[PDB]
Design an enzyme around this catalytic site. Sequence first.
Site, PDB file in Angstrom:
ATOM      1  N   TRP B  82       0.777  -1.010  -0.058  1.00 37.89           N
ATOM      2  CA  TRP B  82      -0.092   0.003  -0.020  1.00 37.89           C
ATOM      3  C   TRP B  82       0.729   1.224  -0.094  1.00 37.89           C
ATOM      4  O   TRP B  82       0.124   2.292  -0.220  1.00 37.89           O
ATOM      5  CB  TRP B  82      -0.979  -0.121   1.295  1.00 37.89           C
ATOM      6  CG  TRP B  82      -1.641  -1.365   1.321  1.00 37.89           C
ATOM      7  CD1 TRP B  82      -1.309  -2.394   2.234  1.00 37.89           C
ATOM      8  CD2 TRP B  82      -2.931  -1.638   0.612  1.00 37.89           C
ATOM      9  NE1 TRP B  82      -2.524  -3.237   2.034  1.00 37.89           N
ATOM     10  CE2 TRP B  82      -3.256  -2.935   1.087  1.00 37.89           C
ATOM     11  CE3 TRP B  82      -3.679  -1.112  -0.232  1.00 37.89           C
ATOM     12  CZ2 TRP B  82      -4.261  -3.650   0.758  1.00 37.89           C
ATOM     13  CZ3 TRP B  82      -4.872  -1.779  -0.637  1.00 37.89           C
ATOM     14  CH2 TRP B  82      -5.280  -2.787  -0.267  1.00 37.89           C
ATOM     15  N   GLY B 118      -7.577   5.930   5.157  1.00 41.76           N
ATOM     16  CA  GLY B 118      -7.832   6.461   6.089  1.00 41.76           C
ATOM     17  C   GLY B 118      -7.600   8.123   5.832  1.00 41.76           C
ATOM     18  O   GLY B 118      -7.267   8.693   6.859  1.00 41.76           O
ATOM     19  N   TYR B 129      -4.626  -1.287  -8.002  1.00 37.28           N
ATOM     20  CA  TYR B 129      -5.693  -0.462  -8.808  1.00 37.28           C
ATOM     21  C   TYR B 129      -5.326  -0.063 -10.143  1.00 37.28           C
ATOM     22  O   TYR B 129      -5.843   0.747 -10.677  1.00 37.28           O
ATOM     23  CB  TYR B 129      -5.617   1.084  -8.148  1.00 37.28           C
ATOM     24  CG  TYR B 129      -5.685   1.093  -6.553  1.00 37.28           C
ATOM     25  CD1 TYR B 129      -6.651   0.077  -5.775  1.00 37.28           C
ATOM     26  CD2 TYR B 129      -4.964   2.069  -5.779  1.00 37.28           C
ATOM     27  CE1 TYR B 129      -6.489   0.323  -4.386  1.00 37.28           C
ATOM     28  CE2 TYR B 129      -5.227   2.394  -4.587  1.00 37.28           C
ATOM     29  CZ  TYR B 129      -6.144   1.399  -3.676  1.00 37.28           C
ATOM     30  OH  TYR B 129      -6.175   1.337  -2.249  1.00 37.28           O
ATOM     31  N   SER B 199     -12.867   1.826   1.494  1.00 42.94           N
ATOM     32  CA  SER B 199     -12.260   2.431   3.016  1.00 42.94           C
ATOM     33  C   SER B 199     -12.651   3.920   2.848  1.00 42.94           C
ATOM     34  O   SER B 199     -14.052   3.994   2.603  1.00 42.94           O
ATOM     35  CB  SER B 199     -10.952   2.219   3.185  1.00 42.94           C
ATOM     36  OG  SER B 199     -10.314   2.915   4.435  1.00 42.94           O
ATOM     37  N   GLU B 324     -13.327  -7.544   8.648  1.00 43.86           N
ATOM     38  CA  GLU B 324     -13.207  -5.932   8.693  1.00 43.86           C
ATOM     39  C   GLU B 324     -11.983  -5.610   9.712  1.00 43.86           C
ATOM     40  O   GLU B 324     -10.930  -5.137   9.338  1.00 43.86           O
ATOM     41  CB  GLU B 324     -14.181  -4.941   8.886  1.00 43.86           C
ATOM     42  CG  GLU B 324     -15.327  -5.040   7.721  1.00 43.86           C
ATOM     43  CD  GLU B 324     -14.797  -4.390   6.313  1.00 43.86           C
ATOM     44  OE1 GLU B 324     -14.072  -3.639   6.305  1.00 43.86           O
ATOM     45  OE2 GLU B 324     -15.254  -5.136   5.388  1.00 43.86           O
ATOM     46  N   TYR B 327      -7.078  -6.547  10.591  1.00 35.70           N
ATOM     47  CA  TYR B 327      -5.971  -5.834  10.191  1.00 35.70           C
ATOM     48  C   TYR B 327      -5.695  -4.821  11.048  1.00 35.70           C
ATOM     49  O   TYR B 327      -4.451  -4.577  11.373  1.00 35.70           O
ATOM     50  CB  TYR B 327      -6.412  -5.132   8.753  1.00 35.70           C
ATOM     51  CG  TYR B 327      -5.540  -4.188   8.347  1.00 35.70           C
ATOM     52  CD1 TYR B 327      -3.936  -4.361   8.068  1.00 35.70           C
ATOM     53  CD2 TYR B 327      -5.849  -2.771   8.439  1.00 35.70           C
ATOM     54  CE1 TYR B 327      -3.292  -3.197   7.789  1.00 35.70           C
ATOM     55  CE2 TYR B 327      -5.104  -1.628   8.021  1.00 35.70           C
ATOM     56  CZ  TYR B 327      -3.622  -2.023   7.921  1.00 35.70           C
ATOM     57  OH  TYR B 327      -2.524  -0.720   7.613  1.00 35.70           O
ATOM     58  N   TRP B 429      -0.720 -11.966   4.778  1.00 35.06           N
ATOM     59  CA  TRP B 429      -1.131 -12.027   6.183  1.00 35.06           C
ATOM     60  C   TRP B 429      -1.435 -13.382   6.909  1.00 35.06           C
ATOM     61  O   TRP B 429      -1.873 -14.084   6.143  1.00 35.06           O
ATOM     62  CB  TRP B 429      -2.253 -10.845   6.512  1.00 35.06           C
ATOM     63  CG  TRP B 429      -2.118  -9.542   6.003  1.00 35.06           C
ATOM     64  CD1 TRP B 429      -2.190  -8.955   4.877  1.00 35.06           C
ATOM     65  CD2 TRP B 429      -1.318  -8.345   6.792  1.00 35.06           C
ATOM     66  NE1 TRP B 429      -1.982  -7.728   4.889  1.00 35.06           N
ATOM     67  CE2 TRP B 429      -1.542  -7.285   5.936  1.00 35.06           C
ATOM     68  CE3 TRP B 429      -1.076  -8.331   8.185  1.00 35.06           C
ATOM     69  CZ2 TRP B 429      -1.127  -6.181   6.443  1.00 35.06           C
ATOM     70  CZ3 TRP B 429      -0.612  -7.250   8.653  1.00 35.06           C
ATOM     71  CH2 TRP B 429      -0.658  -6.123   7.749  1.00 35.06           C
ATOM     72  N   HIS B 437      -9.352  -6.309   5.572  1.00 31.51           N
ATOM     73  CA  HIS B 437      -9.867  -5.023   5.015  1.00 31.51           C
ATOM     74  C   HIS B 437      -8.916  -4.592   3.568  1.00 31.51           C
ATOM     75  O   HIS B 437      -7.803  -4.342   3.913  1.00 31.51           O
ATOM     76  CB  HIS B 437      -9.541  -3.854   6.164  1.00 31.51           C
ATOM     77  CG  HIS B 437     -10.277  -2.594   5.694  1.00 31.51           C
ATOM     78  ND1 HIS B 437     -11.818  -2.173   5.560  1.00 31.51           N
ATOM     79  CD2 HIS B 437      -9.694  -1.235   5.455  1.00 31.51           C
ATOM     80  CE1 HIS B 437     -11.797  -1.078   5.354  1.00 31.51           C
ATOM     81  NE2 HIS B 437     -10.721  -0.365   5.382  1.00 31.51           N
TER      82      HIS B 437
END
Lengths: 61, 531
Positions: B82, B118, B129, B199, B324, B327, B429, B437
């Site tokens: 990310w 966030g 993406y 998100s 959700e 994470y 993970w 999430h």
Amino acid sequence: TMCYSHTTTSRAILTNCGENSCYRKSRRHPPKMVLGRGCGCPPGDDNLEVKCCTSPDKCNY
Amino acid sequence: DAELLVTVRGGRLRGIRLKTPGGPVSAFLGIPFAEPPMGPRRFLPPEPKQPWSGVVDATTFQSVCYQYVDTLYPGFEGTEMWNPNRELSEDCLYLNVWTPYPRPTSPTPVLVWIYGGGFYSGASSLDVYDGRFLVQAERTVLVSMNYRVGAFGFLALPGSREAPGNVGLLDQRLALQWVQENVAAFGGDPTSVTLFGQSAGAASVGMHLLSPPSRGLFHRAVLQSGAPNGPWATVGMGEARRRATQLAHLVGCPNDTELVACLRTRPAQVLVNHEWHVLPQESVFRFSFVPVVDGDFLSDTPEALINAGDFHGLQVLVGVVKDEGSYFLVYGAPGFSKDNESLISRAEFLAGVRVGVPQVSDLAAEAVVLHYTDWLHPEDPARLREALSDVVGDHNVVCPVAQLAGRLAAQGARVYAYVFEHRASTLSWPLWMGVPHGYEIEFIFGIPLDPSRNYTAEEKIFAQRLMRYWANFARTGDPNEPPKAPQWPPYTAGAQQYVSLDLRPLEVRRGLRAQACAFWNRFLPKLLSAT
Ligand SMILES: *[C@@H]1O[C@H](CO)[C@@H](O[C@@H]2O[C@H](CO)[C@@H](O)[C@H](O)[C@H]2NC(C)=O)[C@H](O)[C@H]1NC(C)=O
């Protein structure tokens, strides 16, 4: 020692700290986000928690 | 060549062809849509990009908006996937267009994506993406843009002209306006624009829904694992400037004008260095600078607006992932870590409740603990781990999304709800985290189809099945094949139906974590009120 090194806006990279120790600066209270790792043992604060190490090598992870 | 050249209102662009196991796609990356928010412009609403002479290089992604880089786990994919994959710059307001090859002859439906993170991070240039697969597969124009994050896009001094706030959502809007004026140049149809985000990106979508000026820029909305009404999505004018002032102090500043002026002189990194300090502390799933209820972009709180709104003639697609919460727990919840099964103790579990559910009376936690505790196995770690994970997820994502869905549907909108419950084979993970999430995105974008990646043949089909759903919705405002395959029922406020998205066919279920959400949405409020 071979420790991690980075900033608030950079990625972690191995670097030779040598004799000095290392550090893992992060937000003290959760979210305990990581703000920086590097060589030495710098002072923290109420919000900043600094964890120093020496032996492990790449221990400031 | 040939169709890798397009002329927009601002000027000429030189795109490029991307390869796909099904065919090429024409992509124009890094189109400037606003004058860069440097120095004097920092913190102010974006201004339209002035026409340029010559040809613009749209062969590659532009700078990632200046942000904090999550270095929790050095060298870990689940975390670094990310992180920004381009240079950080305040000069970051650029957008990207993916159009079918050969360019469509008739105006084709457009899909605009707003990334999440966030409000403190994110970039449209991330590998997950990549529009090439979805455009090629469903031949629809796909547009994604960059919007400012952190203080740069959300720090506010409510009422001031120097730091109004929400400029990040303003960047988003400016891009949607750019789409209305230029998307046709790629065969895109401006009378059929569907917004979709995850998100904070989904929260953004929901706010464009609740903000009138944005209403003439799209026709359908898709909120993925996020809603404008989430407890982390907005902040009041009070909190807003308390935080924007703490930051100013920490950075040695100094009258709003005086304050902002000083702020503008600080190097970007200096501001990011103190970003997380301003957080009211003790919690997880909480970000410093987020959208403000200023009365401007948002004339009232998301909640207020959602309730009073008339949503007739609107189709929304909403959903969540199986886990959700998971994470986030690893960012403070005592006993959690990605490096082990985090089999917490009834002791940590209780302290985690206070972490995952910030600012709330001791009695309030008791109410949470009462509900989320299996009283036939109060000490079992495995269950307490899944429990604290539900608390976070439910409180932050599932119940806020669920509520919105009920209100929207109840008040005139066609709604479709889903629960993505399929962990990717490549998932990096821990297994205890299930389907976390943001891990439904890679499939919605058809990344499994990418060769360089090791997905299963069955997941490659799944992604295609999903892309179809999204595309059908964008095109007609309805997921299922506009057949003889399992039908997706609209989400009514009464029946509350939704479908499970995994490798198995569509399975319809009732209740979107209903028993739990009644606590969060109906009781908890009444409790806090009376204390
Ligand atoms: C899983 O990893 C976590 C984090 O490394 C471990 O939690 C630590 O446990 C020690 C006690 O042995 C505490 O002193 C630390 O404060 C804990 N760290 C935090 C804040 O999470 C945990 O013990 C590990 N669980 C297992 C399976 O042993």
